[PDB]
Amino acid sequence: APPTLWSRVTKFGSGWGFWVSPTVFITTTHVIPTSAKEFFGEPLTSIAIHRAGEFTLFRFSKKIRPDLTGMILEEGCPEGTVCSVLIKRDSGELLPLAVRMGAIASMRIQGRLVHGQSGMLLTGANAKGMDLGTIPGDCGAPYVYKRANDWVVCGVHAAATKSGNTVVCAVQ
Amino acid sequence: PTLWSRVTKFGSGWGFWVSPTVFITTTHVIPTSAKEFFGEPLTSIAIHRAGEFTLFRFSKKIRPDLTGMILEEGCPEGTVCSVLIKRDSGELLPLAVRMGAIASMRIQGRLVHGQSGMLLTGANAKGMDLGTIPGDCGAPYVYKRANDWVVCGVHAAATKSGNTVVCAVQA
Ligand SMILES: O=C(COc1ccccc1)Nc1ccccc1O
């Protein structure tokens, strides 16, 4: 995936979030610190927070990331699209895990009720563990794919099954 | 403790530490002018070559941090392997590959002997985090069997469409 998409992935709470533009940051609701009253040096009162289940969007009154261009955010992707999940791991290692996307789904994953776009990892037979699959610390990592001449972001990492084969992306 | 630490830049591609003393790679990526590898004189290294598969056995522990892994001569047909690709970008690309028969295959005009495979990404490039490139040669083919990881060969060749790959195997 291009260097400018990796530059948008920010360590945040117990996982990650993604800069769509200089003023828009998206993440998974459950990684947000529940006591937090300030983000990137800005008070809550100067932020527009839009939460739909496990999808949260922050819109800032000022340009936090002026090095960035605004890119397209869509509400999931067509069934069958192959996406990359942009996962950062220990010591500047970059893991763009390939996932074939499926239908909008509701699941029970480790007792928790999760809703979003389901997908199947294309990394191995069974992706149990950190070498071929996701870990809980990956929540908030973006789902991206390339169209003709450009890249789209279509959601953020919310959950994975105990086998590791099935993932859920939270969508706007 | 990670499989990824075993994948090492080597020659014109990569190789893989099976154990503290055993390193496998693709024959064509190996330097043809050398007096040492990983600081050990070639004097003290056993080299076993079979077609596009090469195994190095060192006389001392180069990677004492590692346990020994199972190395086998390919895998059953229908096994879904992962090819553990490292890129000079810093990206790690594990790609699912459905494995087929051992054969001599014509790959972009040359004959390559090894185990055929097809990527589960299938479609195309369009963000080459979905297929292989020439600099990937020597990347290992692994799969999980019960509690155990198995390595069953090294990346030797791929077709232009990138659907078909060849895993060079021991013996
Ligand atoms: O403003 C920031 C970082 O935090 C600060 C620093 C100084 C004063 C106020 C806030 N930008 C930034 C850079 C890289 C990634 C995400 C970011 O928000």
Side-chain angles (χ1 to χ4, degrees):
Chain A
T4 59
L5 290 184
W6 291 107
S7 182
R8 297 164 186 268
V9 176
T10 309
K11 195 181 182 66
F12 183 80
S14 62
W16 305 86
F18 184 84
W19 290 95
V20 180
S21 73
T23 55
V24 175
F25 183 79
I26 64 174
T27 192
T28 295
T29 307
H30 88 253
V31 314
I32 301 164
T34 66
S35 77
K37 297 312 199 270
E38 191 156 333
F39 302 94
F40 309 98
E42 297 288 303
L44 293 175
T45 71
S46 61
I47 317 172
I49 299 178
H50 299 90
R51 159 254 204 76
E54 268 282 68
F55 189 89
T56 291
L57 185 150
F58 297 71
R59 186 173 275 108
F60 292 85
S61 63
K62 345 226 272 48
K63 295 165 77 156
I64 306 301
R65 287 290 302 271
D67 58 298
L68 301 174
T69 65
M71 69 176 293
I72 294 164
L73 167 66
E74 279 186 351
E75 301 170 350
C77 57
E79 163 258 340
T81 308
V82 181
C83 288
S84 293
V85 189
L86 303 186
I87 295 173
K88 294 185 166 175
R89 293 295 181 67
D90 287 3
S91 208
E93 285 188 327
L94 308 177
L95 185 73
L97 293 181
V99 182
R100 187 165 317 264
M101 302 303 292
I104 301 302
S106 306
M107 308 180 49
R108 191 167 193 193
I109 302 190
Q110 291 279 104
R112 189 149 68 95
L113 295 169
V114 191
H115 181 81
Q117 192 172 5
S118 75
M120 295 192 18
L121 290 179
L122 307 174
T123 61
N126 158 239
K128 177 194 275 289
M130 65 178 26
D131 289 325
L132 305 179
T134 68
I135 65 176
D138 300 334
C139 288
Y143 283 59
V144 301
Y145 68 100
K146 194 186 170 178
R147 281 220 270 252
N149 280 300
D150 64 14
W151 290 81
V152 165
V153 59
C154 65
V156 290
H157 189 64
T161 59
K162 185 185 292 94
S163 103
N165 192 62
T166 297
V167 295
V168 181
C169 147
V171 301
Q172 182 182 41
Chain B
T2 184
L3 290 171
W4 288 108
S5 82
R6 293 170 183 266
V7 185
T8 303
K9 197 170 172 67
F10 190 71
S12 63
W14 307 82
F16 185 70
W17 291 94
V18 174
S19 78
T21 59
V22 174
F23 185 77
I24 63 173
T25 189
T26 294
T27 306
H28 78 253
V29 308
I30 306 175
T32 59
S33 189
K35 83 193 80 186
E36 60 100 348
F37 296 131
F38 300 107
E40 294 298 292
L42 263 156
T43 254
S44 63
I45 309 174
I47 311 182
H48 303 274
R49 187 236 166 160
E52 274 283 59
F53 181 94
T54 295
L55 182 146
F56 298 83
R57 182 174 283 105
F58 293 85
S59 39
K60 53 142 288 197
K61 294 193 197 170
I62 309 307
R63 285 296 303 272
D65 60 299
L66 292 180
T67 61
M69 272 184 77
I70 300 156
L71 173 60
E72 280 180 6
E73 307 185 352
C75 61
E77 291 214 45
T79 303
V80 179
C81 288
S82 307
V83 58
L84 305 187
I85 296 158
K86 280 186 167 177
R87 292 278 164 84
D88 289 336
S89 70
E91 295 172 308
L92 306 186
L93 297 198
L95 291 183
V97 187
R98 192 176 169 236
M99 301 310 293
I102 284 168
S104 294
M105 285 167 279
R106 89 102 108 96
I107 304 293
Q108 309 197 39
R110 72 184 254 262
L111 282 183
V112 188
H113 188 86
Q115 193 163 4
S116 58
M118 287 176 188
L119 293 181
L120 290 198
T121 48
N124 246 236
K126 306 176 190 199
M128 64 188 143
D129 305 344
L130 299 180
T132 70
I133 65 177
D136 294 342
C137 292
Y141 283 67
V142 301
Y143 69 106
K144 198 176 221 277
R145 183 174 74 194
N147 297 329
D148 298 87
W149 292 97
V150 175
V151 53
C152 63
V154 295
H155 188 68
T159 63
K160 290 218 168 174
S161 93
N163 171 105
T164 283
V165 297
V166 182
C167 180
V169 301
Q170 195 177 30

XYZ file of all heavy atoms in Angstrom, chain A residues 7-11 19 22 25 38-42 60 63-68, ligand 1:
196
model
N 1.105 6.694 6.450
C 1.323 7.930 7.238
C 0.042 8.353 7.956
O 0.150 9.069 8.973
C 1.853 9.032 6.344
O 2.117 10.222 7.074
N -1.136 7.936 7.438
C -2.480 8.261 8.008
C -2.871 7.366 9.202
O -3.799 7.743 9.963
C -3.530 8.143 6.905
C -3.355 9.118 5.759
C -4.166 8.726 4.537
N -3.932 9.563 3.359
C -4.652 10.640 3.057
N -5.686 11.047 3.799
N -4.342 11.292 1.962
N -2.160 6.275 9.422
C -2.467 5.301 10.496
C -1.764 5.802 11.769
O -0.516 5.880 11.781
C -2.051 3.868 10.093
C -2.291 2.895 11.237
C -2.802 3.383 8.845
N -2.545 6.135 12.782
C -2.069 6.745 14.061
C -2.371 5.844 15.251
O -3.511 5.419 15.395
C -2.721 8.113 14.289
O -2.544 8.877 13.095
C -2.139 8.853 15.473
N -1.395 5.607 16.124
C -1.625 4.839 17.371
C -2.573 5.651 18.255
O -2.407 6.879 18.327
C -0.304 4.540 18.084
C -0.371 3.472 19.179
C 0.977 3.253 19.849
C 0.973 2.169 20.915
N 0.728 0.838 20.337
N -6.499 9.032 9.494
C -6.768 10.392 8.965
C -7.273 10.301 7.511
O -6.490 9.995 6.582
C -5.528 11.300 9.080
C -5.204 11.666 10.497
C -4.308 11.019 11.312
C -5.839 12.674 11.311
N -4.305 11.598 12.548
C -5.257 12.578 12.600
C -6.862 13.621 11.109
C -5.632 13.434 13.648
C -7.251 14.439 12.153
C -6.651 14.329 13.410
N -7.035 16.391 6.549
C -6.482 17.201 7.642
C -7.396 17.423 8.857
O -6.849 17.661 9.921
C -6.191 18.559 6.974
C -5.976 18.208 5.501
C -6.934 17.062 5.249
N -10.752 12.246 11.282
C -10.106 11.035 11.855
C -11.182 10.002 12.199
O -12.132 10.333 12.923
C -9.328 11.440 13.107
C -8.535 10.374 13.820
C -7.305 9.975 13.328
C -8.972 9.845 15.025
C -6.527 9.049 14.014
C -8.210 8.907 15.714
C -6.982 8.510 15.201
N -9.652 15.571 25.739
C -8.784 16.322 24.803
C -8.207 15.349 23.755
O -7.726 14.266 24.136
C -7.689 16.980 25.642
C -6.883 17.980 24.859
C -6.189 19.060 25.669
O -6.676 19.400 26.766
O -5.159 19.551 25.188
N -8.251 15.713 22.474
C -7.653 14.922 21.368
C -6.829 15.844 20.470
O -7.361 16.853 19.935
C -8.739 14.192 20.578
C -9.604 13.268 21.392
C -10.805 13.702 21.928
C -9.208 11.964 21.634
C -11.595 12.848 22.681
C -10.007 11.105 22.369
C -11.199 11.543 22.890
N -5.573 15.478 20.254
C -4.592 16.237 19.433
C -4.565 17.717 19.865
O -4.530 18.617 18.990
C -4.912 16.047 17.943
C -5.067 14.597 17.542
C -6.322 14.020 17.439
C -3.957 13.797 17.317
C -6.459 12.683 17.107
C -4.094 12.447 17.015
C -5.343 11.903 16.888
N -4.554 17.971 21.176
C -4.481 19.329 21.755
C -5.770 20.136 21.634
O -5.707 21.354 21.913
N -6.903 19.524 21.266
C -8.221 20.202 21.085
C -9.221 19.692 22.116
O -9.344 18.490 22.324
C -8.801 19.975 19.682
C -7.941 20.546 18.581
C -7.975 22.065 18.515
O -9.086 22.615 18.378
O -6.894 22.688 18.630
N -12.562 17.906 13.225
C -11.875 18.992 13.975
C -12.187 20.340 13.311
O -12.360 20.369 12.102
C -10.365 18.724 14.043
C -10.046 17.529 14.905
C -10.074 16.244 14.376
C -9.819 17.672 16.265
C -9.807 15.146 15.175
C -9.562 16.567 17.062
C -9.556 15.304 16.514
N -7.098 22.370 11.040
C -6.296 21.344 10.321
C -5.234 20.754 11.257
O -4.176 21.407 11.481
C -5.625 21.928 9.083
C -6.617 22.379 8.017
C -6.036 23.271 6.968
C -5.213 22.528 5.942
N -5.158 23.289 4.673
N -5.476 19.537 11.729
C -4.538 18.785 12.616
C -3.421 18.182 11.756
O -2.260 18.181 12.219
C -5.314 17.718 13.403
C -6.514 18.288 14.171
C -4.377 16.958 14.314
C -6.177 19.358 15.179
N -3.746 17.699 10.543
C -2.771 17.013 9.649
C -2.737 17.730 8.306
O -3.151 17.191 7.292
C -3.113 15.513 9.506
C -2.822 14.652 10.731
C -1.335 14.471 10.983
N -0.588 13.878 9.870
C -0.380 12.585 9.656
N -0.809 11.667 10.536
N 0.282 12.223 8.558
N -2.165 18.953 8.233
C -2.094 19.694 6.970
C -1.149 19.119 5.904
O -1.198 19.560 4.773
C -1.620 21.083 7.394
C -0.904 20.838 8.712
C -1.666 19.719 9.383
N -0.333 18.141 6.267
C 0.548 17.398 5.330
C -0.300 16.488 4.418
O 0.252 16.006 3.379
C 1.563 16.558 6.112
C 0.923 15.561 7.074
O 0.191 16.003 8.039
O 1.126 14.324 6.827
N -1.562 16.214 4.812
C -2.460 15.245 4.114
C -3.419 15.934 3.150
O -3.856 17.047 3.427
C -3.281 14.419 5.109
C -2.462 13.597 6.092
C -3.389 12.939 7.120
C -1.614 12.577 5.339
O -1.059 17.823 16.596
C -0.559 16.742 16.328
C 0.117 15.976 17.452
O -0.275 16.305 18.781
C -0.019 17.607 19.213
C 1.284 18.079 19.273
C 1.537 19.386 19.667
C 0.510 20.236 20.012
C -0.781 19.766 19.957
C -1.048 18.466 19.551
N -0.550 16.226 15.069
C -0.415 14.870 14.635
C 0.735 14.323 14.071
C 0.762 12.984 13.688
C -0.367 12.196 13.829
C -1.527 12.727 14.355
C -1.555 14.068 14.775
O -2.664 14.643 15.309
